[PDB]
Design a protein around this ligand. Structure first.
Ligand SMILES: OC[C@H]1O[C@@H](O[C@H]2[C@H](O)[C@@H](O)[C@H](O)O[C@@H]2CO)[C@H](O)[C@@H](O)[C@H]1O
Ligand SMILES: OC[C@H]1O[C@@H](O[C@H]2[C@H](O)[C@@H](O)[C@H](O)O[C@@H]2CO)[C@H](O)[C@@H](O)[C@H]1O
Lengths: 135, 135
């Protein structure tokens, strides 16, 4: 399940763009990059209507799936909308991830595990992934 | 090496679009889908300047990498150009692959191995893969 795209090596200095459509009436959706669903260098969660979290971006990582979430970094500079097309571009170096949301903010997050190559990508939650671009 | 895109299950009825740029002064480039580089249900080769083959599309499959190429199906309804951006959309059912080249022809090729799911994608040769889309 999934597609192995042989040509795409998301290494330091490359720009990975993910595009897709957010569901109508969303709770939240995340972009996840790392080694696997359980070992993620970046979990970027856009929470629309999620209890106390209303239009909040939560960023975190985990080495142990759902039982290893570490320190959250949050932002309320929230620019996505339910039912819309979105694009988010990610790049990183040995110190930081650089998150560029199209028509939105640029955010940074630590590269906690000193990764120089990331083999896995998933989108989870209330959205549909339609595009992956690497430049 | 490569990127595992968890969300993309290229199953019967889905449309996989590959986009990218053909090199300047190309010999040829191929789009390859299957289980691995050695076991391919479709090898779609656009040969620009490749000895006797000038602007010829060659389609084939292999179960044994470079030593298992089977019966070629060829077309000279060739519409791509060196140095240009291209997009090719692929879909399939249990009998055939359907190849839609943007601004070009629609071609069919047998689904020789009765595949209903294809986990691997590569572009080889004189071009750069920049985009993968699945709908
Ligand atoms: O950190 C990302 C992670 O958050 C989980 O929820 C957190 C919640 O954000 C926090 O306020 C609370 O203290 O702990 C919860 C559990 O770690 C989500 O459940 C998970 O899906 C991720 O999004
Ligand atoms: O069939 C795809 C496969 O072709 C190889 O070349 C063929 C050539 O097209 C054919 O005319 C000749 O009879 O046999 C050659 C070897 O099988 C390419 O070398 C290979 O890369 C594929 O493109």
């Amino acid at each position: 399940g999934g597609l192995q795209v042989k040509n795409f090596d998301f290494t330091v200095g490359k720009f990975l763009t993910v595009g897709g459509f957010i569901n109508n009436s969303p709770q939240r959706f995340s972009v996840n990059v790392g080694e696997s669903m359980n070992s993620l260098s970046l979990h970027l969660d856009h929470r629309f209507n999620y209890g106390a979290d209303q239009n909040t971006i939560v960023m975190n990582s985990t080495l142990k799936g759902d039982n290893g979430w570490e320190t959250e970094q949050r932002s309320t500079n929230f620019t996505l909308s339910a039912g819309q097309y979105f694009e988010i571009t990610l790049s990183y170096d040995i110190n930081k991830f650089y998150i560029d949301i199209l028509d939105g903010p640029n955010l940074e997050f630590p590269n906690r595990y000193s990764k120089e190559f990331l083999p896995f990508l998933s989108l989870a939650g209330d959205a549909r992934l339609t595009l992956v671009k690497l430049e």
